Write an enzyme that holds these catalytic residues in place. Structure first.
Site, PDB file in Angstrom:
ATOM      1  N   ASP B  35      75.290  18.220  29.871  1.00 45.11           N
ATOM      2  CA  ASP B  35      75.017  19.588  29.400  1.00 45.11           C
ATOM      3  C   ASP B  35      73.997  19.613  28.289  1.00 45.11           C
ATOM      4  O   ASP B  35      74.297  19.438  27.098  1.00 45.11           O
ATOM      5  CB  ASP B  35      76.305  20.293  29.006  1.00 45.11           C
ATOM      6  CG  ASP B  35      75.994  21.736  28.573  1.00 45.11           C
ATOM      7  OD1 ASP B  35      74.970  22.249  29.047  1.00 45.11           O
ATOM      8  OD2 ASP B  35      76.762  22.365  27.857  1.00 45.11           O
ATOM      9  N   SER B 199      57.361  28.832  27.713  1.00 42.76           N
ATOM     10  CA  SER B 199      56.554  28.714  28.959  1.00 42.76           C
ATOM     11  C   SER B 199      55.277  29.545  28.795  1.00 42.76           C
ATOM     12  O   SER B 199      55.396  30.574  28.119  1.00 42.76           O
ATOM     13  CB  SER B 199      57.366  29.258  30.121  1.00 42.76           C
ATOM     14  OG  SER B 199      56.589  29.234  31.315  1.00 42.76           O
TER      15      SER B 199
END
EC number: 3.4.23.22
Lengths: 10, 330
Positions: B35, B199
């Site tokens: 995780d 991004s």
């Protein structure tokens, strides 16, 4: 079906 | 030193992936969900309330010669999907893929919420975000990655998650046979404790790339790809039978549909998620309606590049003193 969503802090 | 372990999805949807990890001495092998959006390593154990344990393998610290109770310390954690657990803490030897760390904090669950009891394939979590998010009190504990950095050949790990197939986590080296072209690295912000990056934009199918900043986290422990409402609405506008469904909780579309690809920018590079990846599966077995892999992050609060995004790439988590995130096509 079954999606996961891993931590909460504030 | 290095380690290499195989990760397998837990079901036919790639809802999540588990990786075996050896705890204790002699080794007890539990299958953990790795995780990168949390920083606790906790497991079902002999201390977990009996009625809350359905098919999972448990860690019995009284059978481990190397276990030490960390006295005073307890932990409590809740996650985005509303699940939660809490307990107390041992330190013990933990090995992944042949890479061993001694005195790793292993968080022992005294109680677990209903979704973890209902998940027979996940014996606990191994968290790989930054140790600032660790929930152990009064003193926070280091993640397995942070404990291993001193001995790794290079401070990195890689995630190479398969599409309906096994994959690999590597620690301490970069397998240049696993990817195509070159890795592009982008800066990480640790301000919130996540592997958080920005991004440079997106395209849908074969249309134009739109330069627009999308700040989000790379989270191996989230299934889907959650992006801002208007980007997600741009995507499903290209799928003729797709609609937002309040009953099911997100965009659905006829399973019949060939879905367009989705591209996200990493600096000047482009990662392209294939259409089939975004097809997450029918909403029921035999249904003609399928659930989309790209959904709105508007009620989460944060954009999440989850397994739908990450399995289309080779991802390098570079944990040097100034961390970065690397992506390559594979």
């Amino acid at each position: 079906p079954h999606p996961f969503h891993x931590v909460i802090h504030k | 030193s290095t380690g290499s372990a195989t990760t397998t999805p837990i079901d036919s949807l790639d809802d999540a992936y588990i990786t075996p990890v050896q705890i204790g001495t002699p080794a007890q092998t539990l299958n953990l969900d790795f995780d990168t959006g949390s920083s606790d390593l906790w497991v079902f154990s002999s201390e977990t309330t009996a009625s809350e344990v359905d098919g999972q393998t448990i860690y019995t610290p009284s059978k481990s010669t190397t276990a030490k109770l960390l006295s005073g310390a307890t932990w409590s954690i809740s996650y985005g999907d509303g699940s939660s657990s809490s307990g107390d803490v041992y330190t013990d030897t933990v090995s992944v893929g042949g890479l061993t760390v001694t005195g790793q904090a292993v968080e022992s669950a005294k109680k677990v919420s209903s979704s973890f009891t209902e998940d027979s394939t996940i014996d606990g979590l191994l968290g790989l975000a930054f140790s600032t998010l660790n929930t152990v009190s009064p003193t926070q504990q280091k993640t397995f990655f942070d404990n291993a950095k001193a001995s790794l050949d290079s401070p990195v790990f890689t995630a190479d998650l398969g599409y309906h197939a096994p994959g690999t986590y590597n620690f301490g080296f970069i397998d240049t046979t696993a990817y195509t072209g070159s890795i592009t690295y982008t800066a990480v912000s640790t301000k919130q404790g996540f592997w958080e990056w920005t991004s440079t934009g997106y395209a849908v199918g074969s249309g134009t790339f739109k330069s627009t900043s999308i700040d989000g986290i790379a989270d191996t422990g989230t299934t889907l790809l959650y992006l801002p409402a208007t980007v997600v609405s741009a995507y499903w506008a290209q799928v003729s039978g797709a609609k937002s469904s309040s009953s099911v909780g997100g965009y659905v579309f006829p399973c019949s549909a060939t879905l367009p690809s989705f591209t996200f920018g990493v600096g000047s590079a482009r990662i392209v998620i294939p259409g089939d990846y975004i097809d997450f599966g029918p909403i029921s077995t035999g249904s003609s309606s399928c659930f989309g892999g790209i959904q709105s992050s508007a009620g989460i609060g944060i954009n999440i590049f989850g397994d739908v995004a990450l399995k289309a790439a080779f991802v390098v988590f570079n944990g040097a003193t100034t961390p970065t995130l690397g992506f390559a096509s594979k």
